[PDB]
Design a protein around this ligand. Structure first.
Ligand code: HEM
Ligand SMILES: Oc1ccc(Br)cc1Br
Length: 137
């Protein structure tokens, strides 16, 4: 289930972070315009950039922290607020986050591992609602 998934993901955090972020950019290429440092670079090029490894690790680590603090896939309002107020998130809307979770859920279903993809879908939906309540457009 959801808690075990956090353990699986945290166990190989960088690899899963890179794979999910790439699944997201592959599914939604226009989203890459938010990441100027990664434009025009192949997957192997990105995986060779310490900047890409560091960014994806730290993003995914915070996502696992938020997931771990949730109760039955309902995140803390304060975690949503952190995400809304981050300067690096200026201009984004709930749609960007919904697309991330669409790609995340799709990745999990295609992986062949036993992720609880329905719980991650619900966690994403609850997090998006929390992001809107905390003021995200
Ligand atoms: C649960 C979802 C998310 C979490 C937990 C999260 C967390 C973070 C964290 C911790 C950072 C700082 C990482 C660093 O040091 O570079 C960051 C930066 C950033 N995030 Fe998010 N993020 C999420 C979703 C998104 C989405 C959906 C987008 C846009 C599609 C986005 C766009 C960005 C950008 C543009 C930066 C700055 C990149 C940079 O400075 O190099 N994030 N995010
Ligand atoms: O910028 C990102 C890095 C890692 C992940 Br997983 C998702 C996003 Br959006």
């Amino acid at each position: 289930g959801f808690k075990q998934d956090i353990a699986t993901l945290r166990g190989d955090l960088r690899t899963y972070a890179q794979d999910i972020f790439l699944a997201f950019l592959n599914k939604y290429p226009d989203e890459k315009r938010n990441f100027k440092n990664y434009v025009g670079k192949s997957d192997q090029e990105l995986k060779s950039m310490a900047k890409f490894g560091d960014h994806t690790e730290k993003v995914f680590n915070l996502m696992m922290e938020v997931a771990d603090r949730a109760t039955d896939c309902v995140p803390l309002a304060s975690d949503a607020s952190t995400l809304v107020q981050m300067k690096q998130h200026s201009g984004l809307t709930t749609g960007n986050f919904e697309k991330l979770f669409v790609a995340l859920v799709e990745y999990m279903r295609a992986s062949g591992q036993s992720f609880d993809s329905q719980s991650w879908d619900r966690f994403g939906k609850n997090l998006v609602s929390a992001l809107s309540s905390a003021g995200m457009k």
